[PDB]
mmCIF file of C-alpha atoms in Angstrom:
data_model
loop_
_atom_site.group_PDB
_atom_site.id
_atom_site.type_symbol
_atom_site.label_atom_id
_atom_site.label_comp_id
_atom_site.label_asym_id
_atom_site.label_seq_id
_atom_site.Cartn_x
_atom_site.Cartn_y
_atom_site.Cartn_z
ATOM 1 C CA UNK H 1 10.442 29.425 15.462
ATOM 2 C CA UNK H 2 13.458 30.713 14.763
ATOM 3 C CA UNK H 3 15.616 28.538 12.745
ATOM 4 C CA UNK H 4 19.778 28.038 12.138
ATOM 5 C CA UNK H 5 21.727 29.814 9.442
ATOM 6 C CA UNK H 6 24.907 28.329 9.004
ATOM 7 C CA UNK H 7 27.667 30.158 6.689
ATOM 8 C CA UNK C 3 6.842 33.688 -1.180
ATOM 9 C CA UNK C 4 8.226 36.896 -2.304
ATOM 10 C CA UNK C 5 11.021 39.398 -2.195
ATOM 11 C CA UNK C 6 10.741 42.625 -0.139
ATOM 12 C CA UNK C 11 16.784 45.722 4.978
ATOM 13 C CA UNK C 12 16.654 42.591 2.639
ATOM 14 C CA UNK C 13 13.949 39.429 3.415
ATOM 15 C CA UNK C 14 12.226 36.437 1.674
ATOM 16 C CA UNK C 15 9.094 35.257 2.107
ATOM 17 C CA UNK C 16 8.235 31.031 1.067
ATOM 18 C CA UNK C 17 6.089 28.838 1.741
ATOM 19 C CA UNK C 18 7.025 25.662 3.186
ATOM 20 C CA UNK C 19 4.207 24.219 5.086
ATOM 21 C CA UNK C 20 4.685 20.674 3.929
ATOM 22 C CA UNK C 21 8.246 20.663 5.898
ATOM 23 C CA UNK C 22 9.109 20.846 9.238
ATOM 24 C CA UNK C 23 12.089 23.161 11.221
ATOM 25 C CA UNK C 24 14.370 19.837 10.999
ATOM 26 C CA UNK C 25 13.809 19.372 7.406
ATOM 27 C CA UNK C 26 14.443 22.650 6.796
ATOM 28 C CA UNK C 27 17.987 24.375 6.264
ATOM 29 C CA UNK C 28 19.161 27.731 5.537
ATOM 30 C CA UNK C 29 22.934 28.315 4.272
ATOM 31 C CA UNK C 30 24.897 31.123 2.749
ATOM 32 C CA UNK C 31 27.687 30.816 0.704
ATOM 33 C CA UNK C 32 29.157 33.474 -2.024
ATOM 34 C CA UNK C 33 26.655 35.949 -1.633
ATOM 35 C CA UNK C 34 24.049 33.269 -1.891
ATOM 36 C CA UNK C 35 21.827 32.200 0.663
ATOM 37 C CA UNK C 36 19.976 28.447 -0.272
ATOM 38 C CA UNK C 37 17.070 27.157 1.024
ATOM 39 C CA UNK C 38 16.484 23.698 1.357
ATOM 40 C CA UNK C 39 13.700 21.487 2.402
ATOM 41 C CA UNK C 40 13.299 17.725 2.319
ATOM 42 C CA UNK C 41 11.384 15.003 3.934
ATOM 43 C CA UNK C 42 11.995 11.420 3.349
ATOM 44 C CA UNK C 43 8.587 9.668 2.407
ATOM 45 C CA UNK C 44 6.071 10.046 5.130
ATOM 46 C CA UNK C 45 2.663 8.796 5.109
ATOM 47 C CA UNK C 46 -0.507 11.185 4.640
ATOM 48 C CA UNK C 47 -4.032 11.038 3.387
ATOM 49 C CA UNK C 48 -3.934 9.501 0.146
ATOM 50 C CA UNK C 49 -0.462 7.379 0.119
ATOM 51 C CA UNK C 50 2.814 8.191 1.226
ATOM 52 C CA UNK C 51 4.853 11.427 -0.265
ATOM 53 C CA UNK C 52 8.381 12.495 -0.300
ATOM 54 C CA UNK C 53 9.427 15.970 -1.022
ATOM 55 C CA UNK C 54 11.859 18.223 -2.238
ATOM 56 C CA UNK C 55 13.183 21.550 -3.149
ATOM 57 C CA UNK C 56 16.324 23.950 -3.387
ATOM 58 C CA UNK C 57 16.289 27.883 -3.438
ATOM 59 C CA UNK C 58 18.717 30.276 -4.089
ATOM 60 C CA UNK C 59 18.825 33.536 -3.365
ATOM 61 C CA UNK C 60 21.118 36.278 -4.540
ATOM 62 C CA UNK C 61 22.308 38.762 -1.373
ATOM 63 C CA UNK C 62 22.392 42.176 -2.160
ATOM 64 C CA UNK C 63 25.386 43.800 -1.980
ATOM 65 C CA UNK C 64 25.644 45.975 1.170
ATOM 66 C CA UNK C 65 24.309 42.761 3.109
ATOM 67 C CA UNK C 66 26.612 41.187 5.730
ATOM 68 C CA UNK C 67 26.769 37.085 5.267
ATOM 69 C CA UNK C 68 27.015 37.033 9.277
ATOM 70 C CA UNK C 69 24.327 38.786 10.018
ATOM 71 C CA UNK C 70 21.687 36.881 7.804
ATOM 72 C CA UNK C 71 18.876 35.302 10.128
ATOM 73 C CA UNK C 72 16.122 32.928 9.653
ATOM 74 C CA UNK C 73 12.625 31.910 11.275
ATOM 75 C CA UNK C 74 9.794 29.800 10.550
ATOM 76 C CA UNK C 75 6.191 30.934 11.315
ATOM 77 C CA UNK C 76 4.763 28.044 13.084
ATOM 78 C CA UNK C 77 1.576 28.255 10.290
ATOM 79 C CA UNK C 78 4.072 27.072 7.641
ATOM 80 C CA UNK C 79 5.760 29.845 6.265
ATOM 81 C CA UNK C 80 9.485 31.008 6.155
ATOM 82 C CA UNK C 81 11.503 34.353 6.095
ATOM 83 C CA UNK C 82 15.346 35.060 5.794
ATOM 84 C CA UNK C 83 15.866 38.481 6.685
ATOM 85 C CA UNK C 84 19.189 40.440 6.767
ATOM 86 C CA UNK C 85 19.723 44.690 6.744
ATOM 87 C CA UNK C 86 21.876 47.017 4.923
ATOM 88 C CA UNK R 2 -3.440 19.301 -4.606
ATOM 89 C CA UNK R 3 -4.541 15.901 -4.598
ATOM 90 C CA UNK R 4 -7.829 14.568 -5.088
ATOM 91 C CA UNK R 5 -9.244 11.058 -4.935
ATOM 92 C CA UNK R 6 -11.936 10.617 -7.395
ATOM 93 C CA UNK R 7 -12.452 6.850 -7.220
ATOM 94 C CA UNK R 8 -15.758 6.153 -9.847
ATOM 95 C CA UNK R 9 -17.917 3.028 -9.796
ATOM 96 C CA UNK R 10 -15.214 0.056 -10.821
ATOM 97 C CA UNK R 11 -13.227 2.894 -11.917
ATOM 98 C CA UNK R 12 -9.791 3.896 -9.874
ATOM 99 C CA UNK R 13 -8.826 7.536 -10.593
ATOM 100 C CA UNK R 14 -6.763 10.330 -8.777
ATOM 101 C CA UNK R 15 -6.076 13.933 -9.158
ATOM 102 C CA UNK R 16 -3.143 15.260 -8.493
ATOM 103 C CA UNK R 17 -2.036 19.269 -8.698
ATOM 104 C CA UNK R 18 1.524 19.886 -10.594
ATOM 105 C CA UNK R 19 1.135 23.082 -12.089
ATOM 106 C CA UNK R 20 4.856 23.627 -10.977
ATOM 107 C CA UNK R 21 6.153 20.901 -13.583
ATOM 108 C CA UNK R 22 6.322 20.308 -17.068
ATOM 109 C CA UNK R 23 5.094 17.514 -18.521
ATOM 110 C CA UNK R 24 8.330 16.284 -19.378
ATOM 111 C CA UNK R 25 9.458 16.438 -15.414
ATOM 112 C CA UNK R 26 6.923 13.916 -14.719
ATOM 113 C CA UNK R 27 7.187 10.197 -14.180
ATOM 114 C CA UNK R 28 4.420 7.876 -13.619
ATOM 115 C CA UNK R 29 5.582 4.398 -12.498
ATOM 116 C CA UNK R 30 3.255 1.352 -11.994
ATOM 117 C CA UNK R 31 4.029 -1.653 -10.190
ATOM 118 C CA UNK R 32 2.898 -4.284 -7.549
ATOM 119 C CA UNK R 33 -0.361 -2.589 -6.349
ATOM 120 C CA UNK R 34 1.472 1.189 -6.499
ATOM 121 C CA UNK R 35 1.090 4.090 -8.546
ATOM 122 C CA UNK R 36 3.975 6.325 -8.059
ATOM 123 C CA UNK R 37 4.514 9.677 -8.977
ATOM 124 C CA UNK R 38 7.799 11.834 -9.284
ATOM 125 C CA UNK R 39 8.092 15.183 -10.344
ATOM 126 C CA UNK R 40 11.530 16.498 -10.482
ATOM 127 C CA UNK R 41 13.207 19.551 -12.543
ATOM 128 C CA UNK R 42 16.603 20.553 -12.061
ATOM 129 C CA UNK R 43 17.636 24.064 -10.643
ATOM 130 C CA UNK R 44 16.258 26.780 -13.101
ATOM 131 C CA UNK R 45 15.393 30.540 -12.926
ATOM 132 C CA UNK R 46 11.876 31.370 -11.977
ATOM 133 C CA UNK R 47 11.308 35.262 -10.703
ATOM 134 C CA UNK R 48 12.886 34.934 -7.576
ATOM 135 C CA UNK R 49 15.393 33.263 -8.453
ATOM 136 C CA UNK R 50 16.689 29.440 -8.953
ATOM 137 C CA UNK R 51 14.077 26.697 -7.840
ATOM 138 C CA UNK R 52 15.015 23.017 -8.257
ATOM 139 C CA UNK R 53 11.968 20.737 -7.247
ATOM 140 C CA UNK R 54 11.688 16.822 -6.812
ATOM 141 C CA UNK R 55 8.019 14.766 -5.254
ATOM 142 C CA UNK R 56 7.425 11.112 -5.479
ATOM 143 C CA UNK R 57 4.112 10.125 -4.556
ATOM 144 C CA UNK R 58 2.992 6.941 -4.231
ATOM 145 C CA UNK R 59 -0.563 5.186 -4.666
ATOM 146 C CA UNK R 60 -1.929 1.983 -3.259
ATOM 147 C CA UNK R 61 -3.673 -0.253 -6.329
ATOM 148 C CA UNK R 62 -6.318 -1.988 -5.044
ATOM 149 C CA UNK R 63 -6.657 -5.881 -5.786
ATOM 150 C CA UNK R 64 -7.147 -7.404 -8.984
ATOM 151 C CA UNK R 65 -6.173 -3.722 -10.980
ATOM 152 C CA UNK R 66 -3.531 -4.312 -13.807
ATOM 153 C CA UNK R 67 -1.060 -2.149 -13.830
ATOM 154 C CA UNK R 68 -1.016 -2.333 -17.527
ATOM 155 C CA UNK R 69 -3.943 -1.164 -17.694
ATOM 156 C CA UNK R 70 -3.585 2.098 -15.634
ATOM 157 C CA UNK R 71 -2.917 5.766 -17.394
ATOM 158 C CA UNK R 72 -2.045 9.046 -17.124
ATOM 159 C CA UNK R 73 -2.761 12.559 -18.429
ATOM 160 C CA UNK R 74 -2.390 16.026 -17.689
ATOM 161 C CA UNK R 75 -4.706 19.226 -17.792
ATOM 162 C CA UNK R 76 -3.419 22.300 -19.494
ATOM 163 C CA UNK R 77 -3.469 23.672 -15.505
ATOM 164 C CA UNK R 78 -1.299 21.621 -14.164
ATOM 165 C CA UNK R 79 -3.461 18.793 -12.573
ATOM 166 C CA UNK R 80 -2.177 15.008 -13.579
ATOM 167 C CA UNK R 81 -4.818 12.636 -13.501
ATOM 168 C CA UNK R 82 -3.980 8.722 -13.101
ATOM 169 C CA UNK R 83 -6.698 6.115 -14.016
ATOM 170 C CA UNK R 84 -7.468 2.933 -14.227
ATOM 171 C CA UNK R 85 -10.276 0.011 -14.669
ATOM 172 C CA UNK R 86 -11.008 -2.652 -12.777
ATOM 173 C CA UNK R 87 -11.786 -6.271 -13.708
ATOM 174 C CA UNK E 1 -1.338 15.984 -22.900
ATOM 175 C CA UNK E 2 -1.619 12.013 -22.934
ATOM 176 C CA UNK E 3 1.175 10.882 -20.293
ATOM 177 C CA UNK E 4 2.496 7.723 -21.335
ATOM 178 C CA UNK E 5 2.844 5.246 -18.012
ATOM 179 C CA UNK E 6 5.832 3.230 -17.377
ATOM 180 C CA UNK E 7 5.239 -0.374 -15.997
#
């Protein structure tokens, strides 16, 4: 489950 | 739930991939996970936590990823 | 990490918090609920900073006094909240 | 170590 990275 | 490109192990079976968020900032990537209080076997718990991580320094911010193994477990992984 | 351990007219759970000091714990009574919070603010461990926070809350069956229910921890991390009954 | 319980 690939999850969000936000920057 | 260790260190070992660049990646993190952690354990964070108690959350689920909405509860979960992964952001870098300043050569930092946090982890957070919280759930409002849910009910379970013995009464009703709410959890939780915050974890920082410093990136290495050849490590793009960009390029950081993230995934959760469906068992409860969660990596951030980026290369050099 | 948590263990019900209910003797006869005795109320008593187990609870494992080997992540917290003692003085990160809070054990609050009131109304028929136990309730548990462990909290410690972001520190080093080995991999870096950690900042933890749990409430957990207990139902107190009928007639218990909340006065009457207490605490203690085990030098391994397990807090253990007890009470009588009438 | 005795945890003190707050009512």
């Amino acid at each position: 489950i690939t999850i969000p990275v936000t920057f | 739930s260790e260190i070992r490109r660049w990646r993190v192990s952690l354990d964070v079976n108690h959350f689920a991939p909405d509860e979960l968020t992964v952001k870098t900032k300043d050569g930092v990537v946090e982890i957070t996970g919280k759930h409002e209080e849910r009910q379970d076997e013995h009464g009703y718990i709410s959890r939780c936590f915050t974890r920082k991580y410093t990136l290495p320094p050849g490590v793009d911010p960009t390029q950081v990823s993230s995934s959760l193994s469906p068992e409860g477990t969660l990596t951030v992984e980026a290369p050099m």
